[PDB]
Design an enzyme around this catalytic site. Sequence first.
Site, short mmCIF file in Angstrom:
data_model
loop_
_atom_site.label_atom_id
_atom_site.label_comp_id
_atom_site.label_asym_id
_atom_site.label_seq_id
_atom_site.Cartn_x
_atom_site.Cartn_y
_atom_site.Cartn_z
N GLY A 22 0.79 -1.22 0.00
CA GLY A 22 0.00 0.00 0.00
C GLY A 22 0.83 1.27 0.00
O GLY A 22 1.99 1.26 -0.40
N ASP A 129 9.11 -6.24 16.43
CA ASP A 129 9.88 -5.51 15.42
C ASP A 129 10.29 -4.11 15.86
O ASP A 129 10.22 -3.17 15.07
CB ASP A 129 9.09 -5.43 14.10
CG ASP A 129 10.00 -5.18 12.90
OD1 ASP A 129 11.24 -5.25 13.07
OD2 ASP A 129 9.47 -4.92 11.79
#
Length: 263
Positions: A22, A129
């Site tokens: 995206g 992360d």
Amino acid sequence: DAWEIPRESLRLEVKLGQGCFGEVWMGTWNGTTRVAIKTLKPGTMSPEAFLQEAQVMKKLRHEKLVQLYAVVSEEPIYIVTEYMSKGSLLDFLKGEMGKYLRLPQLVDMAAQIASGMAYVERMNYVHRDLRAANILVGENLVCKVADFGLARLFPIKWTAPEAALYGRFTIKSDVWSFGILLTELTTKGRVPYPGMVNREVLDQVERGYRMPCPPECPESLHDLMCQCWRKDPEERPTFEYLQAFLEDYFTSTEPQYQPGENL
Ligand SMILES: CC(C)n1nc(-c2ccc(NC(=O)Nc3cccc(C(F)(F)F)c3)cc2)c2c(N)ncnc21
């Protein structure tokens, strides 16, 4: 739910990022509040997998975590979050502003990130992360935690051994990453383990290797890094501890600190 909003209430000014799943745009919401808009390319990636990112941002709410404002769950899907004017910490440390930041500003930034992760810690979540590329910077050096959707109730260089090898991800796995993030802060965003490929990092780290004290970085701060990098996940400190250590740093740990050439 109440998070849903009309499509005409969103105006996408200029695009900031453009991945494959995206895009990310700077825009306006309700013709007043400036926002960050994330788009999903239909066909490439599927919904729900792109919406799970918001399913979790609905529970979590802290002034040091990028806040979800609204969504448009019917494809074309749109995710609306608060706007962080300075982009990623990584780009911030590498860019024009990088040469002026000194240790007191960088440690203050680490304190904010720690505060945000202390919240995650209290809520019993794992980030999976944590890294400079997933931290956003706003006005007046404000830093907030963010990501792409791995929050659960090959970045091997930022991933603790037990997680990269046996998939054992915990809040302690994140503490290890925070240690690597501290090196990113003190080297102005340089990739950690310079001149080493992933395969070397894995062998070396397991063998006990750890990055040395970056130039001009106090040993007391490098010691904090090494604690975050202990082989046994349970010996690593908590984010509550790291938050307090970093906030009080210049009074309790380095009361003699003198500014230098880079730090
Ligand atoms: C650098 C540029 C492409 N960019 N990207 C963002 C942006 C920030 C966060 C997110 N996504 C996000 O924070 N997801 C997420 C997913 C699960 C959990 C969480 C957490 F609660 F942990 F923060 C966050 C997406 C785009 C963003 C923003 N908000 N403001 C100004 N610029 C931005």
